[PDB]
């Protein structure tokens, strides 16, 4: 058996800003909106290698993912991430948001910086939509390395909630109801359950609840991109 070939051919390191924009408010998602309790939990994630999976669709929630989903607590997730030692480059953290939605002139969108290198060229994170039985948003294994042996300049992604598979409640404020055995992580849909706040008998996509912006802010070290990248962001 040979070691698998390297998937990322970019050189040196790159630094990114992750900014998280909530779009989940009583105005955009009126049905049973939790007017008093609504929040986003702290953001937790990391830049990492292919050898570590924080969460993935069709995967089972780790203990740390479960505690984010149910408690809004990033503490066990952060322990799990740090236990991966060299498979993780940067630990990503940003603060909780109470209430969940404000205009940008009122409150800055939470952000964090992270680094990538040839081996830790992926990024994952999650945050809990609260209150909820077990509903998060996030990205899993977003790749910052390009085929051209460079580093992506900007990624913009709109998000819908996903279900961590650990609690069977049907709406934001449902009583605790352990899902046993735990089920696979899956996205929410507009036909999950008639009491779901996202239910629409006509089906169709769920209105996005957040947008994430990932922007490159620096590169370091000799570069080996096969197309020009003359952005003046290489630090000496
Ligand atoms: C979810 O929240 C995000 C963050 O506020 C929203 O993104 C922002 O949306 C507006 C579009 O109305 C963007 O401003 C506009 O940009 C275009 C540039 O092409 C310009 O022509 C307009 O005059 C205006 O300046 C803004 O760039 C964008 N912010 C981002 C991406 O960070 C998003 O629309 C929200 N979605 C919903 C459905 O509420
Ligand atoms: Ca669930």
- Would you say residue 50 lies in a domain? yes
- Whether 113 maps to a domain, the answer reads yes
What letter would DSSP give residue 107?
S
Domain membership of residue 65 (yes or no) is yes
Residue 60, Cβ density class (10 Å: 0-12 exposed, 13-18 middle, ≥19 buried): middle
Following DSSP, what letter does each residue of 14-25 receive, concatenated?
EEEEEEEEE--S
Ligand nearest to the CA of 169: 2
User: Domain count of the chain?
Assistant: 1
Q: Report d(CA 103, CA 160) in Å as an integer.
A: 20
Count of Cβ atoms closer than 10 Å to residue 55 Cβ: 25
Collapsing DSSP states into helix, strand and coil, what is residue 87?
helix
Buried b (16+ CB within 10 A) or exposed e, 172-204: beeeeeebeeeeebeebbbebeeebbbbeeeee
Joined together, the tokens standing for residue 217 give: 């802010």
Q: Is residue 150 part of a domain?
A: yes
- Whether 168 is covered by a domain: the verdict is no
DSSP tag of 66: H
Domain annotation covers residue 190? no
Q: Is 211 in the pocket of ligand 1 (CB under 6 A)?
A: yes
Experimental method: X-ray
d(CA 180, CA 205) in angstroms, rounded, equals 28
Query: Is-cis flag, bond preceding 99, omega within 30?
Result: yes
As for the chain, the residues directly before each break of C–N over 2.5 Å are none
Task: Report d(CA 179, CA 89) in Å as an integer.
Answer: 33
**Integer Rg of the chain from CA:** 19
Full domain range(s) for residue 73: 1-163+209-236
Q: What is the resolution of this structure in A?
A: 2.0
Look up the CATH number of the domain holding residue 107: 2.60.40.2130
Identify which of 18, 19, 21, 213 to mutate to test ligand 1's pocket (most ligand atoms within 8 A of the CB). 21
What residues form DSSP beta bridges with 92? 45
The closest of 137, 140, 122 to 48, measured between CA atoms, is 122
Is residue 117 annotated as involved in ligand binding? no
Query: Tokens 């680094």, residue?
Result: 115
Is 203 inside any structural domain?
no
Tokens of 202: 């006509």
For 187, the token pair is: 């996205």
State the closest ligand 1 atom to the C-alpha of 156, by its place in the atom list counted from 1.
31
Q: How many CB atoms lie within 10 A of CB 231?
A: 11
State the closest ligand 1 atom to the C-alpha of 158, by its place in the atom list counted from 1: 1
Nearest to 50 by CA among 17, 82, 74, 86: 86
Token pair belonging to 218: 């620096």
Residues 6+ apart with CB under 8 A from 87: 48, 49, 51, 52, 120
| 141 occurs within a structural domain | yes
Determine the Cα–Cα distance for residues 123 and 17; give it in Å rounded to an integer.
12
Q: Which of 50, 129, 142, 47 is nearest to 92 (CA)?
A: 47
Task: Return the residue matching tokens 């993912």.
Answer: 65
């Amino acid at each position: 058996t040979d070691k698998p070939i390297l998937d990322c051919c970019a050189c040196g390191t790159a630094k990114y800003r992750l900014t998280f924009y909530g779009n989940w408010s009583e105005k955009t998602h009126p049905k049973d909106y939790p007017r008093r309790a609504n929040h986003w939990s702290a953001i937790i994630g990391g830049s990492h290698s292919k050898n570590y999976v924080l969460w993935e669709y069709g995967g089972y929630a780790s203990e740390g993912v479960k505690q984010v989903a149910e408690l809004g607590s990033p503490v066990k997730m952060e322990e799990e991430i740090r236990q991966q030692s060299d498979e993780v480059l940067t630990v990503i953290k940003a603060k909780a948001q109470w209430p969940a939605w404000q205009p940008l002139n009122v409150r800055a969108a939470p952000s964090a910086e992270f680094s990538v290198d040839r081996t830790r060229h992926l990024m994952s994170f999650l945050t809990m939509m609260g209150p909820s039985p077990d509903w998060n948003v996030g990205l899993s294994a977003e790749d910052l390395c390009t085929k051209e042996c460079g580093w992506v300049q900007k990624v913009v992604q709109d998000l819908i909630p996903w279900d961590a598979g650990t609690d069977s409640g049907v709406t934001y404020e449902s009583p605790n109801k352990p899902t046993i055995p735990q089920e696979k992580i899956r996205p929410l849909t507009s036909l999950d359950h008639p009491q779901s706040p996202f239910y629409d008998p006509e089906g169709g996509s769920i209105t996005q609840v957040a947008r994430v912006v990932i922007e490159r802010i620096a590169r370091k070290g000799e570069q080996c991109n096969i197309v020009p990248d003359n952005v003046d962001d290489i630090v000496a």
